[PDB]
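Both lines are given unchanged directly below:

***
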Amino acid sequence: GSSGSSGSRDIRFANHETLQVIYPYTPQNDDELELVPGDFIFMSPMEQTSTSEGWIYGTSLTTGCSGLLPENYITKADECSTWIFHGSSGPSSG
């Protein structure tokens, strides 16, 4: 069949989200992950743990480590743009 587990080293056929760190954060355990200003964080629903509360499970782009972080330290990725994908536009939407 196909040689490739569910996950992958790179996001090609996955719907992983991308967020940019807006402020640093000093963790205290593994459960959480270190945050760095100017880095990205890949969030996945299959890796969500204690997020619904306020945190968010993702993976760093610089280091490559994953863990829980405060949603109040990151932001949506508005740097990457699609090629044809429209999504939605009109009422102050973009």
About this structure: The chain is about 0% helix and 25% strand. The CA atoms of residues 57 and 68 lie 4 Å apart. The radius of gyration is 15 Å. The longest strand covers residues 55-60.
